[PDB]
Amino acid sequence: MKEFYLTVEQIGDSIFERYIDSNGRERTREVEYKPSLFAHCPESQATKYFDIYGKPCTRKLFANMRDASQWIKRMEDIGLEALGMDDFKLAYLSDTYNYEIKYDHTKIRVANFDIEVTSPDGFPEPSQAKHPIDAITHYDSIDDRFYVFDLLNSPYGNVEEWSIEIAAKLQEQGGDEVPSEIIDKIIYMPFDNEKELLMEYLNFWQQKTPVILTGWNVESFAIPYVYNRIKNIFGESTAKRLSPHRKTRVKVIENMYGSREIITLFGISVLDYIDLYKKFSFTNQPSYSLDYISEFELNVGKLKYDGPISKLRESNHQRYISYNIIAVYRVLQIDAKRQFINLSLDMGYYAKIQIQSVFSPIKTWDAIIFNSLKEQNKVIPQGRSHPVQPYPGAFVKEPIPNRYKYVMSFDLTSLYPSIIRQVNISPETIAGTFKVAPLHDYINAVAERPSDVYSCSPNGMMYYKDRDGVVPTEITKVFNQRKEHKGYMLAAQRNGEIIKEALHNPNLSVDEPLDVDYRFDFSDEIKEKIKKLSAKSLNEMLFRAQRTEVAGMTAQINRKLLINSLYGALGNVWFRYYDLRNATAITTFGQMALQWIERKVNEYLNEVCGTEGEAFVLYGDTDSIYVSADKIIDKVGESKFRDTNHWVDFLDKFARERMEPAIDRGFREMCEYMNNKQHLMFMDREAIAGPPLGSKGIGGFWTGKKRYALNVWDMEGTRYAEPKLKIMGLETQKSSTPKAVQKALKECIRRMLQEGEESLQEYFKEFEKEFRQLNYISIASVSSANNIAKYDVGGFPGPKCPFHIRGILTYNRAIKGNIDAPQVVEGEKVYVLPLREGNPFGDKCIAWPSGTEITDLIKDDVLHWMDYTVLLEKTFIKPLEGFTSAAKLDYEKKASLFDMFDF
DNA sequence: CGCTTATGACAGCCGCG
DNA sequence: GCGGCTGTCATAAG
Ligand SMILES: O=[N+]([O-])c1ccc2c(ccn2[C@H]2C[C@H](O)[C@@H](COP(=O)(O)OP(=O)(O)OP(=O)(O)O)O2)c1
Ligand SMILES: [Mg+2]
């Protein structure tokens, strides 16, 4: 196999690398790296090296990296450009591995761990680490074993060993329900003193040193605490044994209240799963506790225990240890579904960066671009400093608030990257400028053609057509990858819908799930072989089909992020290729393209229809058009379709067979007009929306910008057995809405779109008749706790103090004194509830840490003073009234004046 | 060491016989 | 003591 790296670091004058060798063994190196930077030199000098603008450079070899950095600052102390790759880690990798990296994951040691700390006086701060570590579970990627480190004796009590035979039993038999799949993979190790325990962990750590270190919340807790606990007991020197090269950096990002520690272990790449999730899940959550994410992702109930967590070790040591084991396991199960560690590995090696740099789009692209240039012997510019400056972005159409019965939508495929490609926008391909007309002229085809020789954006920039730019080229690679994985995702989605209507009646039979790849459309044979399978066999395939969709979704949506992030970096001041002439060339172009095709669509439909001046496009956001399909149905008359599924097929045909050909013509005209390299504006048909036939439902509605709802029958080719609701921007999609109100409002919209006026009023009445009965958590709002300190003012609301922050302050007053009570942490999410006049807390609202239940200290008082009437009014009634007004419905029953002749 | 556009819940202030 | 507006903040749609 080819050689590949693990972790690279720079410690002084040397580079420390871990890597896999010729055969597959892990090694280490200390390379006194001699780097090469560049300087501009006279044209008269013959050379091999040129920068991106063509101007000639001379290479400078350095004795060491320390002299190399000295030279750079000396070059700016004088005012001359210091060219080349200033991050020597990246250059060193580029030198050593001057080829495309293939890697074997079975060789990479990925470690998942979690620790436990008993603490009778509140949450144990990693800074101090004053309380003892009584348990650690440590999963090893290569051994495939769960290493358990128990502690039997502690100043907070002494306990007998943990039983593997009891942990395996169901919780209904008084066991723990540690899953069977791992019962044979646990390695148990009891310890009689903490020193003995921690001492063993490090020797263990030494023989099995993690390359990739993951786990739940390990950056903020586990790592700092095992580092600091060891520090307090064995001294700072012994702690450094956590780092393969014995170097660690400590970062005290101390809050306005308490301390906060971030340790950096050199030679290890830490990827906290909480961070991976936040970056790659594309889901804003009300809580980020492991129990919450597990329930959400896996449908597995919480790890139940009696009494306070602090005394769980004392009360029930068996459960304690078992729950530590399961906690590590859940992260593994989530990852098995989300593929975030795999995703991180692909990107990190593709760009030749430190794996933990996957979180930075600026770094990832800087490297990709850097390497791409290096192979053509090109020299990269110096990273200048720039002042932060707002610049114009996309165009969003102002829609007339209303209902819309039949709607059809179209969306441009990676609009911003395609603009980059079409127009050939790159730092070194800048040709010149032209004098700009008002954008409407360009939209209306009125303005004079900008150039007949270069590639033009309506912001006044010109580009060469003759060559290829690094940006357009490198962006096309990741885009093609994204296009691939989107095809599988859409396939398994289409596949799933075939399995989903196939359990409208499964055969009573005993068989086995078919052996197929869900990444592809089922062939006519297997399509026919499906409905011949059983419920138990279909529920298995359905689940697998969705597993592959989930995994394909991950792969696609994140490649889409990275390519949109290249445009983003162009508009970021720390990016080497920061250039607002390029950033605005993109957005201005998009503003034009969207409005151009709006005009053009309104034309082809006026003609095809017969009428004149009709606005068919009701809405648009950035690169999307929403088309009023009503008048196109009128031509065929309302009643001429046997069932719902007929007007969907018809419209899908009218779109693909008629509209898209018209669109494709409309854009190449724009292409000619802007004289671009290659026509790359393709509109993919998205949604088909409307009510069921013979139903009083309304189909869809808009309330404003970014806020609308639609009843969708086909999304991007995928035909649904059951119609799904496309809901955007409304409260049902916000993580700040209470969970019960999310569901209730989703039901109101479904009854509005699919069934009609009457159906709505029925659900409204019953819900508010039952609202008082719901679990308080399910009807609490959610907000994030930012800048608590700013409005603190002795524990009372200061000037301009936000509502949720107010709730936080009133919470802190009530719990003051009792140090065991859960503290509210800066930056984290909180539950918020309104309070009734003259309550014991002496303020109008309370807030506590989210994902949790409130402490028995105040729990009953607050539950007892909850303001159900305000809660229902603001979280539920106002939003509904919002939807209703736009839909022009009632949800109630107004002054009938029929009231008199009732009965 | 590292994107803009937009809505809504609130605070605060202002006019209002 | 309520609506209109501006600004801060949380959070969505791209
Ligand atoms: O820096 N960012 O993080 C960033 C920058 C720009 C971004 C986005 C998210 C969207 N855009 C811009 C650039 C996109 O091309 C355009 C429209 O987005 P979209 O949701 O329609 O998806 P596309 O990127 O067009 O691709 P798709 O339509 O095939 O999904 O809106 C994110
Ligand atoms: Mg798009």
mmCIF file of C-alpha atoms in Angstrom, chain A residues 158-480:
data_model
loop_
_atom_site.group_PDB
_atom_site.id
_atom_site.type_symbol
_atom_site.label_atom_id
_atom_site.label_comp_id
_atom_site.label_asym_id
_atom_site.label_seq_id
_atom_site.Cartn_x
_atom_site.Cartn_y
_atom_site.Cartn_z
ATOM 1 C CA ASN A 158 -16.907 1.895 48.759
ATOM 2 C CA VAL A 159 -18.557 -0.549 46.369
ATOM 3 C CA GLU A 160 -18.273 -4.164 45.201
ATOM 4 C CA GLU A 161 -17.217 -5.016 41.620
ATOM 5 C CA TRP A 162 -19.428 -4.651 38.527
ATOM 6 C CA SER A 163 -21.074 -7.778 37.123
ATOM 7 C CA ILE A 164 -20.980 -8.506 33.401
ATOM 8 C CA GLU A 165 -23.617 -11.231 33.821
ATOM 9 C CA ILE A 166 -26.040 -8.790 35.477
ATOM 10 C CA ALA A 167 -25.370 -5.940 33.002
ATOM 11 C CA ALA A 168 -26.406 -8.254 30.143
ATOM 12 C CA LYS A 169 -29.849 -9.030 31.630
ATOM 13 C CA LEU A 170 -32.905 -6.965 30.705
ATOM 14 C CA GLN A 171 -33.722 -4.036 33.003
ATOM 15 C CA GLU A 172 -36.998 -5.900 33.612
ATOM 16 C CA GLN A 173 -34.940 -8.641 35.298
ATOM 17 C CA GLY A 174 -33.135 -6.048 37.409
ATOM 18 C CA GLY A 175 -30.278 -5.924 34.875
ATOM 19 C CA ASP A 176 -28.825 -3.018 32.870
ATOM 20 C CA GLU A 177 -29.512 -4.074 29.241
ATOM 21 C CA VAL A 178 -25.991 -3.502 27.942
ATOM 22 C CA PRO A 179 -26.506 -4.667 24.332
ATOM 23 C CA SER A 180 -25.472 -8.193 23.308
ATOM 24 C CA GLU A 181 -23.380 -6.924 20.371
ATOM 25 C CA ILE A 182 -20.786 -5.575 22.802
ATOM 26 C CA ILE A 183 -21.098 -7.848 25.888
ATOM 27 C CA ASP A 184 -18.227 -9.961 24.541
ATOM 28 C CA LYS A 185 -16.184 -6.841 23.730
ATOM 29 C CA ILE A 186 -15.991 -5.349 27.246
ATOM 30 C CA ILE A 187 -12.705 -5.670 29.139
ATOM 31 C CA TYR A 188 -13.332 -4.976 32.843
ATOM 32 C CA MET A 189 -10.709 -3.638 35.266
ATOM 33 C CA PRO A 190 -11.527 -2.861 38.927
ATOM 34 C CA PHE A 191 -9.198 -0.623 40.966
ATOM 35 C CA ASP A 192 -8.870 -0.149 44.707
ATOM 36 C CA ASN A 193 -7.234 3.308 44.681
ATOM 37 C CA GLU A 194 -7.534 6.283 42.247
ATOM 38 C CA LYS A 195 -3.755 6.672 41.817
ATOM 39 C CA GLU A 196 -3.648 2.991 40.859
ATOM 40 C CA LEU A 197 -6.476 3.585 38.370
ATOM 41 C CA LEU A 198 -5.130 6.717 36.665
ATOM 42 C CA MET A 199 -1.613 5.258 36.621
ATOM 43 C CA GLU A 200 -2.885 2.263 34.616
ATOM 44 C CA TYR A 201 -4.824 4.418 32.158
ATOM 45 C CA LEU A 202 -1.633 6.191 31.029
ATOM 46 C CA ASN A 203 0.399 3.040 30.395
ATOM 47 C CA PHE A 204 -2.648 1.879 28.469
ATOM 48 C CA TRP A 205 -2.718 5.222 26.673
ATOM 49 C CA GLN A 206 0.963 4.734 25.837
ATOM 50 C CA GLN A 207 0.637 1.363 24.115
ATOM 51 C CA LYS A 208 -2.593 2.341 22.358
ATOM 52 C CA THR A 209 -2.270 6.011 21.500
ATOM 53 C CA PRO A 210 -5.312 7.477 19.703
ATOM 54 C CA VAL A 211 -4.855 9.173 16.325
ATOM 55 C CA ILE A 212 -8.460 10.370 16.231
ATOM 56 C CA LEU A 213 -9.854 11.151 19.665
ATOM 57 C CA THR A 214 -13.658 11.470 19.808
ATOM 58 C CA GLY A 215 -16.532 11.193 22.312
ATOM 59 C CA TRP A 216 -19.430 13.230 23.635
ATOM 60 C CA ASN A 217 -18.324 16.619 24.998
ATOM 61 C CA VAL A 218 -14.683 15.508 25.381
ATOM 62 C CA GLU A 219 -13.193 18.877 24.416
ATOM 63 C CA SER A 220 -15.038 20.682 27.202
ATOM 64 C CA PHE A 221 -14.942 18.038 29.968
ATOM 65 C CA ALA A 222 -13.312 14.598 29.737
ATOM 66 C CA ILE A 223 -9.982 15.732 28.276
ATOM 67 C CA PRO A 224 -9.476 18.778 30.540
ATOM 68 C CA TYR A 225 -10.516 16.812 33.624
ATOM 69 C CA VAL A 226 -8.309 13.744 33.114
ATOM 70 C CA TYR A 227 -5.471 16.112 32.299
ATOM 71 C CA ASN A 228 -6.001 18.362 35.324
ATOM 72 C CA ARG A 229 -6.845 15.567 37.760
ATOM 73 C CA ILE A 230 -3.556 13.869 36.878
ATOM 74 C CA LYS A 231 -1.790 17.235 37.110
ATOM 75 C CA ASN A 232 -3.029 17.798 40.678
ATOM 76 C CA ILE A 233 -2.039 14.286 41.785
ATOM 77 C CA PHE A 234 1.075 13.374 39.768
ATOM 78 C CA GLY A 235 2.311 16.816 38.640
ATOM 79 C CA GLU A 236 2.181 18.571 35.256
ATOM 80 C CA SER A 237 5.014 16.451 33.842
ATOM 81 C CA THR A 238 3.244 13.079 34.090
ATOM 82 C CA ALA A 239 0.088 14.554 32.488
ATOM 83 C CA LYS A 240 2.014 15.423 29.326
ATOM 84 C CA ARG A 241 2.159 11.659 28.752
ATOM 85 C CA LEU A 242 -1.288 12.117 27.172
ATOM 86 C CA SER A 243 0.566 13.723 24.226
ATOM 87 C CA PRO A 244 2.693 11.338 22.103
ATOM 88 C CA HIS A 245 5.309 14.127 21.898
ATOM 89 C CA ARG A 246 4.845 15.286 25.519
ATOM 90 C CA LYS A 247 3.763 18.807 24.524
ATOM 91 C CA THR A 248 0.441 20.302 25.591
ATOM 92 C CA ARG A 249 -1.071 23.797 25.403
ATOM 93 C CA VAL A 250 -3.579 25.033 28.030
ATOM 94 C CA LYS A 251 -6.131 27.726 27.109
ATOM 95 C CA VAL A 252 -8.111 29.527 29.817
ATOM 96 C CA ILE A 253 -11.133 31.074 28.014
ATOM 97 C CA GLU A 254 -12.489 32.033 31.458
ATOM 98 C CA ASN A 255 -16.071 33.317 31.662
ATOM 99 C CA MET A 256 -17.308 36.390 33.586
ATOM 100 C CA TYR A 257 -18.411 33.820 36.226
ATOM 101 C CA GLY A 258 -16.224 30.681 36.277
ATOM 102 C CA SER A 259 -13.121 29.220 34.617
ATOM 103 C CA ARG A 260 -13.024 27.309 31.312
ATOM 104 C CA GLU A 261 -10.169 25.129 30.034
ATOM 105 C CA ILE A 262 -9.171 23.980 26.541
ATOM 106 C CA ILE A 263 -6.202 21.584 26.440
ATOM 107 C CA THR A 264 -4.379 20.910 23.153
ATOM 108 C CA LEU A 265 -2.697 17.493 23.007
ATOM 109 C CA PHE A 266 0.045 17.569 20.351
ATOM 110 C CA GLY A 267 0.200 14.614 17.971
ATOM 111 C CA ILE A 268 -3.472 13.804 18.539
ATOM 112 C CA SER A 269 -6.401 15.005 16.427
ATOM 113 C CA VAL A 270 -9.405 15.697 18.673
ATOM 114 C CA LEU A 271 -12.809 15.573 16.962
ATOM 115 C CA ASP A 272 -15.516 16.099 19.588
ATOM 116 C CA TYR A 273 -18.714 14.440 18.331
ATOM 117 C CA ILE A 274 -20.771 17.321 19.657
ATOM 118 C CA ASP A 275 -18.775 19.590 17.311
ATOM 119 C CA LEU A 276 -19.001 17.158 14.395
ATOM 120 C CA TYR A 277 -22.743 16.963 14.934
ATOM 121 C CA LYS A 278 -23.225 20.731 15.135
ATOM 122 C CA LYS A 279 -21.163 21.187 11.957
ATOM 123 C CA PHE A 280 -22.507 18.315 9.855
ATOM 124 C CA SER A 281 -25.975 17.327 11.134
ATOM 125 C CA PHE A 282 -27.791 20.314 9.587
ATOM 126 C CA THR A 283 -30.145 20.283 12.595
ATOM 127 C CA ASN A 284 -30.478 22.958 15.288
ATOM 128 C CA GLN A 285 -31.524 21.124 18.495
ATOM 129 C CA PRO A 286 -33.257 22.311 21.715
ATOM 130 C CA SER A 287 -30.745 20.306 23.786
ATOM 131 C CA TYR A 288 -27.346 18.752 23.098
ATOM 132 C CA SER A 289 -27.386 16.187 25.878
ATOM 133 C CA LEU A 290 -26.458 12.687 24.743
ATOM 134 C CA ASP A 291 -29.887 11.341 25.854
ATOM 135 C CA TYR A 292 -31.647 13.852 23.598
ATOM 136 C CA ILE A 293 -29.538 13.175 20.490
ATOM 137 C CA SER A 294 -29.838 9.413 21.072
ATOM 138 C CA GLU A 295 -33.619 9.601 21.276
ATOM 139 C CA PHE A 296 -33.759 11.822 18.214
ATOM 140 C CA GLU A 297 -31.299 9.809 16.095
ATOM 141 C CA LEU A 298 -31.856 6.218 17.279
ATOM 142 C CA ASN A 299 -35.299 5.974 18.984
ATOM 143 C CA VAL A 300 -33.719 4.623 22.147
ATOM 144 C CA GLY A 301 -35.147 5.700 25.507
ATOM 145 C CA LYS A 302 -33.123 7.459 28.211
ATOM 146 C CA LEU A 303 -30.806 5.632 30.606
ATOM 147 C CA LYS A 304 -33.174 5.600 33.605
ATOM 148 C CA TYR A 305 -31.925 5.844 37.203
ATOM 149 C CA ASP A 306 -33.327 6.630 40.643
ATOM 150 C CA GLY A 307 -32.233 9.667 42.670
ATOM 151 C CA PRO A 308 -29.552 12.333 41.889
ATOM 152 C CA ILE A 309 -26.759 11.478 39.441
ATOM 153 C CA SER A 310 -24.158 12.350 42.101
ATOM 154 C CA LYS A 311 -25.299 9.516 44.361
ATOM 155 C CA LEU A 312 -25.888 7.002 41.554
ATOM 156 C CA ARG A 313 -22.517 5.405 42.314
ATOM 157 C CA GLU A 314 -23.512 4.860 45.929
ATOM 158 C CA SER A 315 -27.136 3.812 45.478
ATOM 159 C CA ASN A 316 -26.491 1.593 42.470
ATOM 160 C CA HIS A 317 -22.894 1.062 41.339
ATOM 161 C CA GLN A 318 -23.963 -1.607 38.830
ATOM 162 C CA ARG A 319 -26.155 0.816 36.868
ATOM 163 C CA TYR A 320 -23.477 3.530 37.200
ATOM 164 C CA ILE A 321 -20.732 1.550 35.471
ATOM 165 C CA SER A 322 -23.189 0.114 32.911
ATOM 166 C CA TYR A 323 -24.463 3.557 31.967
ATOM 167 C CA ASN A 324 -20.884 4.722 31.462
ATOM 168 C CA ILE A 325 -20.408 1.814 29.029
ATOM 169 C CA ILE A 326 -23.630 2.544 27.140
ATOM 170 C CA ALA A 327 -22.809 6.271 26.833
ATOM 171 C CA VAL A 328 -19.670 5.475 24.868
ATOM 172 C CA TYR A 329 -21.629 2.979 22.796
ATOM 173 C CA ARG A 330 -24.341 5.438 21.768
ATOM 174 C CA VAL A 331 -21.825 7.795 20.191
ATOM 175 C CA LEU A 332 -20.708 4.781 18.123
ATOM 176 C CA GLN A 333 -24.321 4.020 17.089
ATOM 177 C CA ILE A 334 -25.000 7.628 16.081
ATOM 178 C CA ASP A 335 -21.788 7.665 14.016
ATOM 179 C CA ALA A 336 -22.659 4.355 12.404
ATOM 180 C CA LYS A 337 -25.699 6.245 11.069
ATOM 181 C CA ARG A 338 -24.259 9.737 10.452
ATOM 182 C CA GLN A 339 -20.787 8.771 9.108
ATOM 183 C CA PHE A 340 -19.254 12.018 10.416
ATOM 184 C CA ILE A 341 -15.869 10.443 11.278
ATOM 185 C CA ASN A 342 -15.641 8.827 7.828
ATOM 186 C CA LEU A 343 -16.699 12.185 6.275
ATOM 187 C CA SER A 344 -13.967 13.967 8.247
ATOM 188 C CA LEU A 345 -11.376 11.453 7.069
ATOM 189 C CA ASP A 346 -12.269 11.781 3.381
ATOM 190 C CA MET A 347 -12.035 15.582 3.407
ATOM 191 C CA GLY A 348 -8.928 15.835 5.561
ATOM 192 C CA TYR A 349 -6.887 13.622 3.278
ATOM 193 C CA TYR A 350 -8.384 14.998 0.075
ATOM 194 C CA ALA A 351 -7.105 18.436 1.024
ATOM 195 C CA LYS A 352 -3.942 17.184 2.783
ATOM 196 C CA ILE A 353 -4.681 18.998 6.071
ATOM 197 C CA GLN A 354 -4.603 18.103 9.752
ATOM 198 C CA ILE A 355 -7.845 16.126 10.196
ATOM 199 C CA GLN A 356 -9.054 18.510 12.944
ATOM 200 C CA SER A 357 -8.919 21.321 10.360
ATOM 201 C CA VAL A 358 -12.050 19.958 8.663
ATOM 202 C CA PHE A 359 -13.982 22.532 10.763
ATOM 203 C CA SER A 360 -12.319 25.400 8.886
ATOM 204 C CA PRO A 361 -13.462 25.958 5.268
ATOM 205 C CA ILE A 362 -10.731 28.639 4.907
ATOM 206 C CA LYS A 363 -7.981 26.150 5.828
ATOM 207 C CA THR A 364 -9.416 23.314 3.733
ATOM 208 C CA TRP A 365 -9.602 25.429 0.593
ATOM 209 C CA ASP A 366 -6.294 27.193 1.213
ATOM 210 C CA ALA A 367 -4.650 23.771 1.138
ATOM 211 C CA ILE A 368 -6.641 22.397 -1.830
ATOM 212 C CA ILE A 369 -5.823 25.539 -3.817
ATOM 213 C CA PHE A 370 -2.215 25.537 -2.549
ATOM 214 C CA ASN A 371 -1.583 21.927 -3.650
ATOM 215 C CA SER A 372 -3.327 22.496 -6.959
ATOM 216 C CA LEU A 373 -0.953 25.390 -7.737
ATOM 217 C CA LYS A 374 2.196 23.625 -6.489
ATOM 218 C CA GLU A 375 1.896 20.847 -9.089
ATOM 219 C CA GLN A 376 1.988 23.466 -11.867
ATOM 220 C CA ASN A 377 5.091 25.043 -10.232
ATOM 221 C CA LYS A 378 2.992 28.107 -9.240
ATOM 222 C CA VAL A 379 3.567 30.416 -6.264
ATOM 223 C CA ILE A 380 0.747 31.423 -3.894
ATOM 224 C CA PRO A 381 0.273 35.081 -2.775
ATOM 225 C CA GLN A 382 0.883 36.382 0.750
ATOM 226 C CA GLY A 383 -2.107 36.586 3.105
ATOM 227 C CA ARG A 384 -2.796 40.317 3.432
ATOM 228 C CA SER A 385 -4.917 41.960 6.127
ATOM 229 C CA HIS A 386 -8.205 43.629 5.173
ATOM 230 C CA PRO A 387 -10.888 45.748 6.835
ATOM 231 C CA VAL A 388 -14.263 44.029 7.435
ATOM 232 C CA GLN A 389 -16.831 45.354 4.958
ATOM 233 C CA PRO A 390 -20.510 44.487 4.292
ATOM 234 C CA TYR A 391 -21.375 43.601 0.708
ATOM 235 C CA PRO A 392 -24.598 42.837 -1.243
ATOM 236 C CA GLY A 393 -25.913 39.263 -1.465
ATOM 237 C CA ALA A 394 -28.976 37.582 -2.966
ATOM 238 C CA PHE A 395 -32.372 38.723 -4.296
ATOM 239 C CA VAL A 396 -35.496 37.711 -2.375
ATOM 240 C CA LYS A 397 -38.932 38.341 -3.893
ATOM 241 C CA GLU A 398 -41.650 40.059 -1.825
ATOM 242 C CA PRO A 399 -44.675 37.776 -2.111
ATOM 243 C CA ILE A 400 -48.309 38.903 -1.772
ATOM 244 C CA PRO A 401 -49.525 37.162 1.399
ATOM 245 C CA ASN A 402 -52.208 34.735 0.276
ATOM 246 C CA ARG A 403 -53.172 31.137 -0.456
ATOM 247 C CA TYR A 404 -52.040 29.295 -3.606
ATOM 248 C CA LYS A 405 -53.793 26.110 -4.715
ATOM 249 C CA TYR A 406 -51.491 24.513 -7.288
ATOM 250 C CA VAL A 407 -47.818 25.446 -7.178
ATOM 251 C CA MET A 408 -44.733 24.181 -9.047
ATOM 252 C CA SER A 409 -41.110 25.047 -8.169
ATOM 253 C CA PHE A 410 -37.654 25.137 -9.801
ATOM 254 C CA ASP A 411 -34.165 25.561 -8.291
ATOM 255 C CA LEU A 412 -30.717 26.210 -9.838
ATOM 256 C CA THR A 413 -28.153 23.433 -9.285
ATOM 257 C CA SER A 414 -25.381 24.797 -7.058
ATOM 258 C CA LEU A 415 -26.054 28.327 -8.275
ATOM 259 C CA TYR A 416 -23.006 30.012 -6.789
ATOM 260 C CA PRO A 417 -20.444 27.352 -7.821
ATOM 261 C CA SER A 418 -21.988 27.253 -11.325
ATOM 262 C CA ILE A 419 -21.620 31.026 -11.630
ATOM 263 C CA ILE A 420 -17.936 30.545 -10.677
ATOM 264 C CA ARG A 421 -17.613 27.964 -13.431
ATOM 265 C CA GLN A 422 -19.765 29.683 -16.071
ATOM 266 C CA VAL A 423 -18.076 33.060 -15.666
ATOM 267 C CA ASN A 424 -14.614 31.599 -14.830
ATOM 268 C CA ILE A 425 -14.186 33.631 -11.621
ATOM 269 C CA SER A 426 -10.704 33.163 -10.145
ATOM 270 C CA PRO A 427 -8.050 35.452 -8.548
ATOM 271 C CA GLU A 428 -5.678 35.110 -11.545
ATOM 272 C CA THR A 429 -8.227 35.153 -14.397
ATOM 273 C CA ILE A 430 -9.271 38.789 -13.907
ATOM 274 C CA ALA A 431 -9.239 40.443 -17.365
ATOM 275 C CA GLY A 432 -10.486 43.972 -16.626
ATOM 276 C CA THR A 433 -13.635 45.957 -15.891
ATOM 277 C CA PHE A 434 -16.439 47.642 -17.797
ATOM 278 C CA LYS A 435 -18.743 50.572 -17.016
ATOM 279 C CA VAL A 436 -21.829 49.266 -15.289
ATOM 280 C CA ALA A 437 -25.468 49.988 -16.076
ATOM 281 C CA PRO A 438 -28.280 49.685 -13.507
ATOM 282 C CA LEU A 439 -28.986 45.952 -13.004
ATOM 283 C CA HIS A 440 -32.628 46.193 -14.223
ATOM 284 C CA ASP A 441 -31.337 47.102 -17.706
ATOM 285 C CA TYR A 442 -29.374 43.848 -17.788
ATOM 286 C CA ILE A 443 -32.423 41.976 -16.445
ATOM 287 C CA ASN A 444 -34.601 43.558 -19.152
ATOM 288 C CA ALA A 445 -31.960 42.992 -21.875
ATOM 289 C CA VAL A 446 -31.944 46.772 -22.449
ATOM 290 C CA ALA A 447 -28.316 47.627 -21.572
ATOM 291 C CA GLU A 448 -25.487 47.379 -24.101
ATOM 292 C CA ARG A 449 -23.556 44.105 -24.256
ATOM 293 C CA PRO A 450 -20.646 44.486 -21.742
ATOM 294 C CA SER A 451 -17.982 42.710 -23.851
ATOM 295 C CA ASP A 452 -17.740 40.538 -26.970
ATOM 296 C CA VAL A 453 -14.317 39.144 -26.018
ATOM 297 C CA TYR A 454 -14.170 38.420 -22.244
ATOM 298 C CA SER A 455 -16.442 36.649 -19.705
ATOM 299 C CA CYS A 456 -18.597 39.188 -17.848
ATOM 300 C CA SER A 457 -20.497 39.602 -14.598
ATOM 301 C CA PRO A 458 -23.138 42.396 -14.282
ATOM 302 C CA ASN A 459 -21.083 43.884 -11.424
ATOM 303 C CA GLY A 460 -18.496 45.181 -13.890
ATOM 304 C CA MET A 461 -15.848 42.453 -13.871
ATOM 305 C CA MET A 462 -14.318 40.687 -16.892
ATOM 306 C CA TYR A 463 -12.611 37.300 -17.076
ATOM 307 C CA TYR A 464 -10.543 35.306 -19.593
ATOM 308 C CA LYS A 465 -12.231 32.483 -21.503
ATOM 309 C CA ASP A 466 -8.973 31.046 -22.879
ATOM 310 C CA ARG A 467 -7.579 29.402 -19.734
ATOM 311 C CA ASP A 468 -8.732 27.620 -16.572
ATOM 312 C CA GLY A 469 -8.631 29.173 -13.097
ATOM 313 C CA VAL A 470 -7.699 27.292 -9.938
ATOM 314 C CA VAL A 471 -11.005 28.151 -8.276
ATOM 315 C CA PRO A 472 -13.288 27.018 -11.141
ATOM 316 C CA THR A 473 -11.168 23.850 -11.542
ATOM 317 C CA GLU A 474 -10.970 22.780 -7.910
ATOM 318 C CA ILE A 475 -14.610 23.641 -7.309
ATOM 319 C CA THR A 476 -15.655 21.402 -10.253
ATOM 320 C CA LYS A 477 -13.975 18.356 -8.648
ATOM 321 C CA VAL A 478 -15.891 18.528 -5.348
ATOM 322 C CA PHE A 479 -19.089 19.447 -7.249
ATOM 323 C CA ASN A 480 -18.859 16.293 -9.392
#
